[PDB]
Amino acid sequence: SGFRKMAFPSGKVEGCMVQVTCGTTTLNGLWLDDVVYCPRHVICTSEDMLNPNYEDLLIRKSNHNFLVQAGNVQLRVIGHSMQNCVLKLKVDTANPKTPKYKFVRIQPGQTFSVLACYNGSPSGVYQCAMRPNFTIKGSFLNGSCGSVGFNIDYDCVSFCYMHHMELPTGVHAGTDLEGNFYGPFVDRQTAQAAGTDTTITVNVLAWLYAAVINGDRWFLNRFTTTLNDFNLVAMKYNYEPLTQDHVDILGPLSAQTGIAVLDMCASLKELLQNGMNGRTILGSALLEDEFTPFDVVRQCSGVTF
Amino acid sequence: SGFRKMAFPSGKVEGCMVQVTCGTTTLNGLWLDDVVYCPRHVICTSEDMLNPNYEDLLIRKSNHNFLVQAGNVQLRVIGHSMQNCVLKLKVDTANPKTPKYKFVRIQPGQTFSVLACYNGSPSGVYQCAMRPNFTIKGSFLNGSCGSVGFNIDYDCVSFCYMHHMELPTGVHAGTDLEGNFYGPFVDRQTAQAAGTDTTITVNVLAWLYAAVINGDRWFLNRFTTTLNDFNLVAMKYNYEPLTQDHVDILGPLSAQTGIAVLDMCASLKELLQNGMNGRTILGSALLEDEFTPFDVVRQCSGVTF
Numbered sequence A, B: 001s002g003f004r005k006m007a008f009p010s011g012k013v014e015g016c017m018v019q020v021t022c023g024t025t026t027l028n029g030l031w032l033d034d035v036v037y038c039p040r041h042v043i044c045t046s047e048d049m050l051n052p053n054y055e056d057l058l059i060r061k062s063n064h065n066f067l068v069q070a071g072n073v074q075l076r077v078i079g080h081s082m083q084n085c086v087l088k089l090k091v092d093t094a095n096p097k098t099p100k101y102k103f104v105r106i107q108p109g110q111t112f113s114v115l116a117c118y119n120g121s122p123s124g125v126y127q128c129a130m131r132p133n134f135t136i137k138g139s140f141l142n143g144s145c146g147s148v149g150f151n152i153d154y155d156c157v158s159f160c161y162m163h164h165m166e167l168p169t170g171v172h173a174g175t176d177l178e179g180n181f182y183g184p185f186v187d188r189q190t191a192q193a194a195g196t197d198t199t200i201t202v203n204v205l206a207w208l209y210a211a212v213i214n215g216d217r218w219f220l221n222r223f224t225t226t227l228n229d230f231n232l233v234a235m236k237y238n239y240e241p242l243t244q245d246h247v248d249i250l251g252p253l254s255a256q257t258g259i260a261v262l263d264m265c266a267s268l269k270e271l272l273q274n275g276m277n278g279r280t281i282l283g284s285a286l287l288e289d290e291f292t293p294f295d296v297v298r299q300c301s302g303v304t305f
């Protein structure tokens, strides 16, 4: 029993993190096979970031201008390519620690584990969620660029994120491993705005099941609601709308508790309309929305790797 | 910027986790050099756990009763030992992935990273804190026994915890790597109570510094308090007393913020007496106490490993 902000084991990813240096900028890269992936602004100066032309800047670069180092091994760049906003550097050695991997593009609401590194070496791991506005609320200091977020499927590492920027508001933005940004953001140091963040309602419902599984059950009530009735109260509170697909996905948790999904929705409706009245659920006085339903199944069903 | 519940990268520890089977019981073990460390109740049946005689049971056990498996490879037990509550099994092979390590016994209030494994396979990682009552509030399903907690110091893994049991209240208890239980607990299935839990005040003050570093500054006040004045208000709210040794430890954070330690104590005193009044600190409506001052410095400095 117990519920914790838990992240996938990061060992597999740790063997893929290299230090990439171009000019005076040093950031992190992801070494998979004989290719290193790093955020393409490695090539920019502090003055270039304000309005960068990356095709002109990369033309001025050469293979010997990129210094890639995996621990004690200095890899040699034998090629450089720019796919969208990521720079792929071809290297003369292949990472023997390359895991079975796949590049995926996650959706808003999905969560992932972030291996935050600085100058190529892992510093920590924590669980994040792709916010509905395609930002994330992580912890990234200068040099954490090229830190990647991922999920593991038994033995297959699904790389889903690479960090690029902290927006002026403090929220973070990044790309998939093919270089396409999550959200309306650009790798240019100009004021950029993120959309109004909304609450992932299906993840709140997932968290409330984890709460019932653990012994907090004061919030349960004998009523049942409709998806539409709930969604009018939810939309008012900047809460995401619940579809039939969310109800289907919550099926497994409903099954192990015997609490129908529209039965828990009625409990979530009273919480939003009446607050928690100074009570806590799983120890929190607020409603957590960064646990997918799959996260709850994992933490209360094992799921090893 | 950003502040997250972050855990040390678990790759190093992953290379030490093995599956240990004695009889019908199968749990996790820690493979360091030619010794596997596992919880000594591996030798117990559910009928033995209710009142176990570990000296009587171990007599009936021999080296061939223990089945240790590192993935696909069967390690061969050539010796078995019982130190306090841990079973040290000698094996015919030494772990080639052994990190430079040390067994440490942490204090209440110190934090560590937990690698939760099941059946020998790492499943997840999260950051915990030794509660003042010598419990920890993690996430452990049956089979999680022998999971280890740790901190990393550059390249040296400091193993500080091994999980043994979940108490009836839902909180968790375990040992150091020498088998000595943290707290007043015994490895027997009988109702056992933990002492009254208190709030680690030094970790709240550390966390409030993490908040100011990040932009949360509504709680700051022009007033300053005395250590005695503060400790009289805190004890009433079941907050641990803050000593001059704690103030010394918070020094680095005071230097980086320009906010004296007793200046922050004055902000904490109003928070205890007046609550948060619909404000959040780093996104929370409650006061977090599971971040040590070294954790805050680590997350706001970039310490790698």
Ligand SMILES: *CCC(=O)[C@H](Cc1ccccc1)NC(=O)[C@H](CC(C)C)NC(=O)COc1cccc(OC)c1
Residues within 6 Å of the ligand: A027, A041, A049, A140, A141, A142, A143, A144, A145, A146, A164, A165, A166, A167, A168, A186, A187, A188, A189, A190, A191, A192, B001
């Ligand atoms: C790994 C961090 C960086 O290298 C990154 C470069 C960068 C790219 C694009 C826009 C701005 C900077 N810097 C970065 O994100 C910093 C990190 C802070 C911890 C200092 N953030 C800022 O500089 C914030 O200011 C800012 C101003 C205007 C635009 C913008 O992003 C759109 C950020």
Ligand SMILES: *CCC(=O)[C@H](Cc1ccccc1)NC(=O)[C@H](CC(C)C)NC(=O)COc1cccc(OC)c1
Residues within 6 Å of the ligand: A001, B041, B049, B140, B141, B142, B143, B144, B145, B146, B164, B165, B166, B167, B168, B186, B187, B188, B189, B190, B191, B192
């Ligand atoms: C890895 C988990 C175990 O193997 C462990 C064995 C054990 C040791 C000591 C006392 C009791 C059990 N079991 C364990 O802790 C379970 C785990 C739950 C996820 C089922 N917890 C309980 O059985 C809780 O009940 C309990 C009753 C009486 C005493 C006691 O601990 C003192 C726990």
Ligand SMILES: [Cl-]
Residues within 6 Å of the ligand: A083, A084, A178
């Ligand atoms: Cl593409």
Ligand SMILES: [Cl-]
Residues within 6 Å of the ligand: B078, B079, B080
């Ligand atoms: Cl022997």
Ligand code: NA
Residues within 6 Å of the ligand: A220, A221, A222, A223, A224, A263, A264, A266, A267
């Ligand atoms: Na209900």
Ligand code: NA
Residues within 6 Å of the ligand: B220, B221, B222, B223, B224, B262, B263, B264, B266, B267
């Ligand atoms: Na003050």
